[PDB]
Structure formats: C-alpha cells, structure tokens
Amino acid sequence: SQSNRELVVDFLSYKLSQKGYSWSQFSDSSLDAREVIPMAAVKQALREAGDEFELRYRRAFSDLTSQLHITPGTAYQSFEQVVNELFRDGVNWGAIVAFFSFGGALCVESVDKEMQVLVSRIASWMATYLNDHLEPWIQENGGWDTFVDLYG
C-alpha cells in the first residue's frame, strides 16, 4: 500500500528533521457514496502522537534497539522479529504509535552513527511491516479515520 509507505516517509522525515538531520546526504464536498483516508490529517496526528510518546517514555526501545543492533548487514527478518515484540500483547493504536516512534529512533541514531544508508532500509521495512502485519487490523479497527478521532 502506497499510503502507509507515504505515512512512513512523512513520519521519519519529520523525526529526522526535528533532530537537525535529513533524509539524504544532500536533501537540505464529497458526496455520500465514497471512501478514503485522508492523509494530511493522519500525518499531523501521527506526528503529535509520536512527539507525546517520546516525551512520556524517555526509556523505551533501548532494550529493543540493543536487540536489533542494526548495521549495514541487517536484513528485514531481524527488524520484523524485534518489532513483533512491540506487538507481543496484540495490536492497538498506542502500539502502532510506538512502532513509528521506534523506526524514527533507529533512523536518527543511524544518522548519528554515520549509517545514513539505513534510513531508506528502515522506511522500506516499516512499510512492509505495516502492510503485512498491521494493515488487516487497521482496516478492521476503523481504519486511519479512527486514529485521527483518538489522537487528532
């Protein structure tokens, strides 16, 4: 799905930017029958929610990130295995915000450590994770319109 990919990139570029980094080494009415997301509102809400999450949990992921110990060698399987652990008690919208914040944080840390190559990898992994693992839940749970109504 192109729009979970779009939410991944928006969220990660906002996190990178907020810490003073960048994506790339030179990147500096409807009608009554219908049905879509709609994006700019999901992206804003995910942003604010990711920021609240980071403000509340100074701690999280240090266990998780040391478990991935991500390098230019890491494959998708290993990321998928660590993220499965954020979802160990099941999925809900809080666990989804923690998943995005985790990806934000591996990104920032990778830039920090000189492994900018990992940014697009993580983004690509997240989009795959979301589409394989989380999408069937999201669609059943009110879709993204519902996440907005809780974290908008």
Cβ-contact 42, 48 below 8 angstroms: no
**Solving technique for this entry?**
X-ray
What total of structural domains would you count in the chain? 1
Taking the C-alpha atoms of residue 151 and residue 20, their distance in angstroms, rounded to an integer, is: 25
Taking the C-alpha atoms of residue 36 and residue 29, their distance in angstroms, rounded to an integer, is: 13
Q: Count the alpha carbons within 13 Å of 109 in the hemisphere toward its beta carbon.
A: 15
Assign residue 128 the CATH number of its domain: 1.10.437.10
- Examine residue 136 and say whether the peptide bond preceding it is cis (omega within 30 degrees of 0): no
Q: State this model's resolution in angstroms.
A: 2.3
Q: Is 119 exposed, middle or buried (0-12, 13-18, 19+ CB in 10 A)?
A: buried
Buried-state track 25-46, b at ≥16 Cβ within 10 A, e below 16: eeeeeeeeeeeeeeeeebbebb
Range of the domain at 2: 1-152
User: Sign (positive/negative) of CA torsion 115, 120, 123, 125?
Assistant: negative
